[PDB]
Amino acid sequence: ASRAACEALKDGNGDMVWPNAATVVEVAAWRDAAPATASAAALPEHCEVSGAIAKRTGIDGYPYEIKFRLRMPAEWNGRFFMEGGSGTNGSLSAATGSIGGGQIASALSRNFAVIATDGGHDNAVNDNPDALGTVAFGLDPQARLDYGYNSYDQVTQAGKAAVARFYGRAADKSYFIGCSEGGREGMMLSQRFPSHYDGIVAGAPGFQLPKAGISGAWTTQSLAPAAVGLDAQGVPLINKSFSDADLHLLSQAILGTCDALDGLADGIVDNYRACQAAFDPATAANPANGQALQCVGAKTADCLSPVQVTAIKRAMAGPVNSAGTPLYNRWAWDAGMSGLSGTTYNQGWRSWWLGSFNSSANNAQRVSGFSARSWLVDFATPPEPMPMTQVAARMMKFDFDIDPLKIWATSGQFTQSSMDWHGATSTDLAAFRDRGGKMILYHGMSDAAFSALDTADWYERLGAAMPGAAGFARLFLVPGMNHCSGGPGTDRFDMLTPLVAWVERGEAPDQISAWSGTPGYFGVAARTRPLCPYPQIARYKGSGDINTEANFACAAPP
Ligand SMILES: [Ca+2]
């Protein structure tokens, strides 16, 4: 481990042999120790290796390759680390090792050898203006296979080869941490390549991402009756269906109905199952005056329109076809759909289905943004690129009897369906568990991108196929937490420490310490709570400060 060993990986006559012959290294530079800053932990002396694998040309004429960045510390804990992606990937991160949970420390700051990838395409090169911008990679079938599983496999094999070459020995254990799309990766790793990583953290995982566009079309068509006004193309303004004050009224009614169902009134719905059975906005009341939430006469700032409650109920039910078959899943009611801290309302929930209120056009993720564009180009087979101005209308005429079949369809050179290369719904985790693999999953209740109930349903099927699943896999649902972060909940936590303590040392996480990044939702300076493994919830012990984990334990729901 030295500077010369770092630069000898930059091709030359050196004996660094890559598993894939098509691996090309651009950068191999020795980096000095960066002292800690106010927002990041100290990074040690490390070797940075940057390169690309499988440089080719797609069937669309665009150049494709699988980029990687690798940082290897001089003082190394013998452990390997890969961080997951986000969105449709296409960008190469700093490769310091984000562990999620709003953490100051990075994996590299903890002396891990860190690797990262771009997914098999670049957002600067593969930006076709006739194929909905940065999702244009979906026009080439191999770029889909790289975004699905191939790129992460290839980068993992190259990273371990370089680690073994630079350190003279193989990594002891390998760990992966990803949120959203990176959470889908982590589950895909445990299923397609169980031998690669010993510990895996998958947060808010989109293990059914090709289905999010179907829910997005259902969302749009359910809320359109409540929409007020048209945009430049005559599409209803979904963002105008609910004001930010309206959403706060809804989250307040959920709080008035389900907050005490866990045994404590604290602005947190810890008994999510009891809320689904108890809450119905058509019958619930506004806790601020005891009157009913659904308006009896004309709309006021103290009531929701009957057309509004109907719309949100249909959206939360989940998409179905005329045959009644559920196309995705239903969503959970939770207080994290809104939230007012200081001046700002919570946008972490409405930004997916509705969009920003003060906008004369649609800007919801599922109406015209990246999510709807991604389904049209990357998840549907054959892909249907189009002008951006027509994506909103495409989600308005979405036929739930013809269009949902495109995520299982195959056509021409697109030899694999999107649910085949992107899906991660398998419960075949025996090979992963039996070699010592441990997996931690977390998901917020107020996640509008992916349903936490759907993650729980997968966790139930895993426990059915493999008795004793809690010995290698636990699910930690987070109340109030939005997608990956934000909302009135404890969204900050260190998940790399328990993951290491589980894989090695064999200590199962009976709970996970967590605190709130914005405690002002509850009007306090700080709030710390334990995250409990499914299906346990946090139970108040009966005395002490309600903003300290020491007064809370993990118990079965009351
Ligand atoms: Ca509570």
We report the CATH number of the domain holding residue 39 as 3.40.50
Q: Are residues 98 and 205 in the same domain?
A: yes
Select which of 196, 483, 485, 516 is catalytic. Answer: 483
Q: Are residues 205 and 227 in the same domain?
A: no
Cα angle 328, 420, 320 (rounded to 5 degrees) comes to: 20
Q: Are residues 53 and 149 in the same domain?
A: yes
Which one-letter amino acid corresponds to residue 502? W
Q: Which residues contact 283 (CB under 8 A, 6 or more apart)?
A: 292, 294
Nearest-CA neighbor of 209 among 371, 409, 369?
A: 371
Q: Is 426 a catalytic residue?
A: no
**Do the annotations mark residue 366 as ligand-binding?**
yes
Q: Choose the final residue of a domain: 404, 419, 434.
A: 419
How many angstroms separate the alpha carbon of residue 478 from the centre of ligand 1?
12
Return the SS3 of 492: strand
CB 474 within 8 A of CB 534: yes
- My answer on whether omega of the bond before 385 falls inside 30° of 0, hence cis, is no
Count structural domains, the chain.
Answer: 2
Q: Choose the final residue of a domain: 397, 419, 441.
A: 419
Nearest-CA neighbor of 142 among 233, 201, 58?
A: 58
Cα–Cα distances in angstroms (integers) from residue 456 to residues 21, 185, 377, 514, in the given order: 41, 18, 29, 20
**Do the annotations mark residue 266 as ligand-binding?**
yes
Select which of 447, 454, 485, 491 is catalytic. Answer: 447
Q: Are residues 476 and 358 in the same domain?
A: no
User: How many angstroms separate the CA atoms of 358 and 243, rounded?
Assistant: 9
Question: Which residues are 214's β-sheet partners?
Answer: none
How many angstroms separate the alpha carbon of residue 296 from the centre of ligand 1?
30
Q: Is 180 a catalytic residue?
A: yes
**Do the annotations mark residue 87 as ligand-binding?**
yes
Q: Are residues 397 and 485 in the same domain?
A: no
Nearest-CA neighbor of 348 among 247, 265, 214?
A: 247
How many angstroms separate the alpha carbon of residue 525 from the centre of ligand 1?
18
Q: Residue 264: which domain range?
A: 211-419
Nearest-CA neighbor of 450 among 253, 183, 262, 244?
A: 183
Q: Are residues 17 and 58 in the same domain?
A: yes
Q: What is the DSSP letter of 394?
A: H
DSSP 29-56: EEEPPBPP-SSSPPB-SEEEEEEEEEEE
User: How many angstroms separate the CA atoms of 99 and 105, rounded?
Assistant: 8
Q: Are residues 408 and 274 in the same domain?
A: yes
How many angstroms separate the alpha carbon of residue 490 from the centre of ligand 1?
13
Select which of 180, 215, 251, 374 is catalytic. Answer: 180
Q: Are residues 370 and 502 in the same domain?
A: no
User: How many angstroms separate the CA atoms of 491 and 531, rounded?
Assistant: 10
Q: Are residues 361 and 510 in the same domain?
A: no
| Alpha helices per DSSP H over 381-439 | 391-396, 418-421, 430-434
Q: Are residues 484 and 391 in the same domain?
A: no
How many angstroms separate the alpha carbon of residue 438 from the centre of ligand 1?
30
**Do the annotations mark residue 264 as ligand-binding?**
yes
How many angstroms separate the alpha carbon of residue 531 from the centre of ligand 1?
13
Residue 544's Cβ-side half-sphere holds a number of Cα atoms within 13 Å equal to: 14
User: How many angstroms separate the CA atoms of 22 and 54, rounded?
Assistant: 5
Long-range contact set of residues 543-547: C-beta below 8 Å, sequence gap at least 24: 546/264, 546/266, 547/519, 547/522
Give me the residue label for tokens 């003082």: 75
Return the SS3 of 131: coil
Kindly give the interhelix angle for 212-223 and 306-317, rounded to the nearest 10 degrees.
170
Cross-sheet strand order for the sheet of 528-531: 492-493, 512-515, 528-531
Cα–Cα distances in angstroms (integers) from residue 356 to residues 316, 347, 361, 363, 373, in the given order: 19, 8, 9, 7, 18
How many angstroms separate the alpha carbon of residue 372 from the centre of ligand 1?
35
Q: Choose the final residue of a domain: 362, 390, 419.
A: 419
Nearest-CA neighbor of 223 among 313, 119, 311, 102?
A: 311
Kindly give the interhelix angle for 181-192 and 151-167, rounded to the nearest 10 degrees.
80
Give the technique used to solve this structure.
X-ray
- CB burial string 417-436: b at 16+ within 10 A, e below: bbbbbbbbebbebeebbeee
Q: Are residues 19 and 74 in the same domain?
A: yes
**Do the annotations mark residue 238 as ligand-binding?**
no
CB 366 within 8 A of CB 212: yes
Q: Are residues 203 and 229 in the same domain?
A: no
Q: Is 447 a catalytic residue?
A: yes
How many angstroms separate the alpha carbon of residue 267 from the centre of ligand 1?
6
User: How many angstroms separate the CA atoms of 49 and 443, rounded?
Assistant: 33
